[PDB]
Structure formats: C-alpha cells, structure tokens
Amino acid sequence: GEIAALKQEIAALKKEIAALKFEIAALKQGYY
Amino acid sequence: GEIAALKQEIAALKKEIAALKFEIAALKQGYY
Amino acid sequence: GEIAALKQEIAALKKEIAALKFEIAALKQGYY
C-alpha cells in the first residue's frame, strides 16, 4: 500500500544520494 | 497530518537532489 | 510504528544532503 510506496521512495532517494557521493569522490580525485 | 508532512519532506529532498545533480554536472565540465 | 521509522529515515537523508551541499560548495571554491 501507501506505506510500502513511501518506503520505495526512501530507497530511491538513498540510491540517488549514493550516486551523488560517487560523483563527489571523482571530483575530489580530479582535484588532489 | 504526519503522513502529509512526510510526503512534503520527500518532495523537498527530491528538489535538493535535483539542484545537487545540476551543480555536479556543471562542475564536472567547468560550466558556470 | 512505520511513520516514526520513515521520519527517522528522512532525518538521516536531510543530514546526508547537508553534507553533500557543503562538499559541493567547497569543490566549487577549489576549482574556481
């Protein structure tokens, strides 16, 4: 139901955040 | 009420993630 | 219950976003 849907939304946000952390790591690698 | 608030908070996180994706993509290309 | 759990997940995501925003701000100073 809707609670499960909200949990799926949270899971999707976590994956988005992880992806951005990878991008930041790459930018730091390029910098130093 | 708390459920409505949680959904608003999720919407706000999606907007922040979008802004971050943009800033990262811009930085990777040296586009300001 | 489930709503309290979701609120805790959202709180964690908000901290993660804050950290990313800081890192991106710092990288912009580094690169530009």
Q: Which residue in C32, A26, A13 sits closest to B24, CA to CA?
A: A26
Neighbours of C2 (CB within 10 A): 11
Task: Return the closest-CA partner of residue C6 out of B7, A1, B14.
Answer: B7
Q: Of C27, C19, B20, C1, which Cα lies nearest the Cα of A3?
A: C1
How was this model experimentally determined? Answer: X-ray
Interface of B with C (CB under 8 A): 2-3, 6, 9-10, 13, 16-17, 20, 23-24, 27, 30, 32
Nearest CB to C20; choose among A6, A10, A20: A20
In a 3-state reduction of DSSP, which class is residue B30? Answer: coil
The C-alpha atoms of residue C24 and residue B29 are separated, in whole angstroms, by 14
Least CB–CB distance from C20: residue in A7, A14, A24: A24
Chain B neighbours (≥3 Cβ pairs under 8 A) are A, C
Distance CA B12, CA C22 (A): 18
Which residues lie closer than 8 Å to A21 by C-beta, 6 or more apart? Answer: C20
